[PDB]
Ligand binder design. Sequence first.
Ligand SMILES: Cc1ncc(C[n+]2csc(CCOP(=O)(O)OP(=O)(O)O)c2C)c(N)n1
Ligand SMILES: [Ca+2]
Ligand SMILES: [Cl-]
Length: 365
Amino acid sequence: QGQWDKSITFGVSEAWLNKKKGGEKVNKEVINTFLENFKKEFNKLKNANDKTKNFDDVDFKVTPIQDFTVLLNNLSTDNPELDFGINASGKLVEFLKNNPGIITPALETTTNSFVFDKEKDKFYVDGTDSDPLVKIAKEINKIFVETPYASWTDENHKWNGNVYQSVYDPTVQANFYRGMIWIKGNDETLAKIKKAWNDKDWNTFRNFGILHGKDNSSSKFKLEETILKNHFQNKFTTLNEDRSAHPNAYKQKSADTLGTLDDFHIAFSEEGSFAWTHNKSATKPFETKANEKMEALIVTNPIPYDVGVFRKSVNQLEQNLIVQTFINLAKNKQDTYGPLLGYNGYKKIDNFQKEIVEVYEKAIK
Ligand SMILES: Cc1ncc(C[n+]2csc(CCOP(=O)(O)OP(=O)(O)O)c2C)c(N)n1
Ligand SMILES: [Ca+2]
Ligand SMILES: [Cl-]
């Protein structure tokens, strides 16, 4: 059933942990009270239960990790110095396809729903104006274009240091997230792009210039690739092959810089990424030339939110207490770390294949 481990180490993003807010390291103070709250609730549950109270009390710590490849690789070695971490779901499903059973997924995060995307079960249909993913994109434009983002204020949109709270409905927890496709130009260019989209003219559409993230990203590459393949039926095989033949039509850069590239007019991003991007930042995110606008074209199919995974030999009883400690901390509003990453709630995973793998595979098909 695995070994009881009296020391539990959470892997966290190195870049996040050393985050200096005025030379200070706030996140480090944030994670220590989280850890202190976690230890006390965990050991309370453990000692309250007859099956686990005779095991040693457990101490919790964190360790900084470079990136998610080191997290998954490190966990798969099943070394007690690193026991648990939370990873994007698509990347994890891809890892476990290669090397099945090597690590153990156990909990699912949830995030406050966007006011414009409260229902999971909207999928691509045909990319026309009655397509449910196009309808969500129109709702996003009402929020981001009609009431222009550049003029939002911290008080207007309830900025809390973390996110713009006015674009969220915390009463509804979303089981999922989506990517989205942005388009940018003056009036004539926007119309030309929508025409190429409606005419399913791939070559013209792609030649407007596509900004994308890394090849292994779900929400900045793969989910969009799926929509494009389904909309422009049989016109290219994969975005990587297409790029190979048309390298100047593609650039790896964040969508919020799209306004600064005169040569590019299409960009991939996570849905609603402006919601956690302060419009007053030095980089001037989402800014565009005077007579140009940036707007949403369509969003993607949905995939699960991030997943917490264990090295394989942590005792099963211990795993379940840790899972329930995350859930109760969030309920008691004692989770000071999660909300900073977008994790506003937690759920136990009862069936990985049904709840995570199948949901992801249907979205990229
Ligand atoms: C406060 C806050 N809310 C939400 C986010 C966004 N977010 C957190 S976890 C997650 C899901 C996994 O996304 P990502 O790690 O970018 O993996 P990818 O889609 O690139 O594979 C997202 C979109 C954030 N960075 N900050
Ligand atoms: Ca350990
Ligand atoms: Cl119990």
